[PDB]
Design a protein around this nucleic acid. Sequence first.
DNA 1: TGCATCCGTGAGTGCAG
DNA 2: TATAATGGGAGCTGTCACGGATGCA
Lengths: 346, 48, 243, 96, 49, 144, 98
Amino acid sequence: SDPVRQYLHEIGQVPLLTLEEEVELARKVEEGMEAIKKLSEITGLDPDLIREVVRAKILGSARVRHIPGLKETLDPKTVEEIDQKLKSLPKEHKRYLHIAREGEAARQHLIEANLRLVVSIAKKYTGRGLSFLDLIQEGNQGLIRAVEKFEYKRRFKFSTYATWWIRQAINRAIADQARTIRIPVHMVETINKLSRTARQLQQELGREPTYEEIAEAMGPGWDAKRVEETLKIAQEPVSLETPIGDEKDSFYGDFIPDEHLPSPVDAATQSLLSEELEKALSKLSEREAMVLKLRKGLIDGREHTLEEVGAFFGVTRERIRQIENKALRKLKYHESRTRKLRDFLD
Amino acid sequence: QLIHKDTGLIKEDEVFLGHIPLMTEDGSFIINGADRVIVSQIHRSPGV
Amino acid sequence: DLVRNVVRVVESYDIDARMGAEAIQQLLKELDLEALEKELLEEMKHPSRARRAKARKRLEVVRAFLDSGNRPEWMILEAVPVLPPDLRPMVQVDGGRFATSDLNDLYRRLINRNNRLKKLLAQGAPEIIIRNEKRMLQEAVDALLDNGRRGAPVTNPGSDRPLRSLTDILSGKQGRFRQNLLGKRVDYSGRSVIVVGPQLKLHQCGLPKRMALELFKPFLLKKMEEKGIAPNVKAARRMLERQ
Amino acid sequence: GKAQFGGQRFGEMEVWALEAYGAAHTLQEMLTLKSDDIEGRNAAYEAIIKGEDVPEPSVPESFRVLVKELQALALDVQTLDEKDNPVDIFEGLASK
Amino acid sequence: DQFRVGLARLARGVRERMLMGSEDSLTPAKLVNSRPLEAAIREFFSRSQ
Amino acid sequence: KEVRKVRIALASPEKIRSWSYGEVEKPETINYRTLKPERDGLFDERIFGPIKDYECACGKYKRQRFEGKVCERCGVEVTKSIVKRYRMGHIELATPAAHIWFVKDVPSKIGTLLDLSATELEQVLYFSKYIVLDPKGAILNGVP
Amino acid sequence: EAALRDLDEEGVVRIGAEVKPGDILVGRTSFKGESEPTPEERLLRSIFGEKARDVKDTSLRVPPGEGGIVVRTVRLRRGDPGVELKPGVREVVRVYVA
DNA sequence: TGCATCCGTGAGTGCAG
DNA sequence: TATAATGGGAGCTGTCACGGATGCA
Ligand SMILES: [Zn+2]
């Protein structure tokens, strides 16, 4: 029923490792990687392309997908094909295909074994924009990192080394998907700075600080202006469906006009202009009301300075610029009788 | 006062918690500069 | 075993036993619908009338699909559709602040999971992990479409307000049908207090002239020209805009 | 609402009223030109100011919202002419 | 009542920073983040029914 | 031609993709500085449409004589902005997912179509129990 | 100037005035967007010897059916003493009307 | 087979808000 | 990037009536 007690139960099935099984699995994973590029420079294929094939066969054909980064599409034909020039090796070279396979198999039991640890870390990064499970999965995600980077020979327990990548990966998710407006992980980092320093200022003053009382305690390069515009981008949006009233028959979104699409006044105001100016071109001359009807656009606009003006108008380059003045001139006298244009300047 | 469950640590500060809104004489409140009233609520009462 | 130089075999089968919609999309995909119809009427012939009864209910679903040409597996989604952005906007209100539909946060919620599943796959993860990611993915999709329907409803942080799922949009007294299709708000309309006019004739009423002006503002603008109280319609309008 | 410069809600029960009278065209007007048939709405307020009768209306933009919201639930709603072939009430703006 | 709910949240956050961050160089000052209290009050007065 | 009926029916995944203009890859809305839409995200205009009429995103083509050209620099069509209202996108799922209507609308439509109980379809769907497609001869507690 | 005769130099109505529908109570200017004049509009001004202005009348007028006698004005800027407003706002003006 | 019993779906209008 | 750390946390309450689908003597 409850999708957390569920996962809390699957986890509770894989037993916890003991010190030997810890170092056993860790050891096998290390050796198996070594095995994989020893296995690569023998056959000369590619460590990763080889690693995925070890990976497929251990987990079953249940899963295989063309892995981004590999150059060929890893379909079950190339996994039999390539598992073949693999098992084709001498017992002292194909020695290592058994090493890899053993490694991948220990990779798993070492991840699966240490999931209860992730839980006990994500548990305390709650209420930060991401849900428990979302946090767990991210936590897990880092755990995977931890095994491909563990060094059993340093003698540390596994808990210790992984508790780094785990929180390293929660914290990157809390800071990369929480906000509806994604803000670079470092800006997020400095924002939290203002928050925490403002908080101590308030705990010191007995009132919330001003902008400047922050720019000071924030140090140098920090002025009041720069704390302010940092806060307004820090600003999280709000729901169009937020409730307006204690009943629920109005949405905050309902009181919001649609500025984009033209209103019917405007819609109409545009069509009457763009023809009562066509009602001032065919009034004195329609080929001088056409070369300056092409010094801009009736639609699309056509206006540069001197270059296509010089290509196809019929006339020379600075003669179209003169009937440009007289086309305009005539309209400025033309538009002392049909004075139905002033209104359009608002 | 913080005290350590094991050593006997003693620190003592008075930490600012924020502002509580006060009630005027006529028995109302000013919240973002707008008088308001807190209507009593009737409910069933604790008991068996 | 290279230490013991034995080859071990553990008693265990190559069974194909799945979980999730992956399974169901397959079982659905393997339905010869005409076959099942055959069997069901072939059992519509039974007594006890409760077997005859359910064979109807089921057969009604079959013949539903047969007569339309819908494929049962289509009740499963590979490609979730996404609704045009203007129908779920992000807008700047007066104070340069931003206002956004719930859907964006329900998609966002989903695309994070589909994405970290595409990653959790390629980086080869244990099932127990991959499992939690697919489940979580369904719950994502089950909230985009009908949040609250199953289990807990998806609330944003810092409140208990269900997000508004596509079915929430569609349905209810405030749904799309009843609040925008079977009746909208309207232009050229006004409200005021009423007051008895006994002098009125049966077919008449008393309309404040200021209500009149707006309600007929187009018509007034024109006539205002067809006489000359203004040169054109656009200047006529600017007259009536300050009292 | 007054403060937004509202319009007046012509609700279900009002629609019924117009329905009972049989005022088809007056109802159609309240459902298109006066609310959200952006084409014929813009089209009318030009016809009034110009002294021409109001244009017959196209489809309410709010029905479209309905289509696209059903698409977004994986539901394929199709306007069909009498010989059962689709009708693009988006005038090709969604076709490819 | 609303006050007993800010105090409640504030205590969830002190013990959190009691069992992580440094178990001996700590004060009342920095083991308390008032805001969970602040917002519970602000809430009862600005959006209660 | 003249609308006279309204058909409603299921969307094949291919068809959903038939609608789409873009796979929404990133859960990003709009850039925290430009306040413009981030590409490959929920408001990317190369998918959905020109935000401003007959004006491509970056500045390339900016009026009606260009109409339909997808500029090279930024990749946005030159059309009416009204299309951000009609152009569907799609999200390509890694493992497929059940339309909860056909799950939980009692009596289930998938659950009756396969003689699957209510509480079976849940378990198999919310991962409480496996469901065999080919036991390859397995046997459990002395019964295949 | 008619449409401004009751505003001080800053753009506030003068305390003690009569304001009715349409009347500006506070002049405000705001910058024009990526609709900085289109061809239709650049050209129309090309005729009138007044080139495209870059600010806009966003003033606060009075709504239909309201009005009265300006009784008071509060002007809160920032950069002044006492005062600091929500982020991104320079100044706010309130004008009470009787 | 007939009948508890649970789960899901409804619960007036417009206006001020 | 390395002491060690390995299964959550808040339920919410004073409606009702009908219709359908499921469990059980
Ligand atoms: Zn471009």
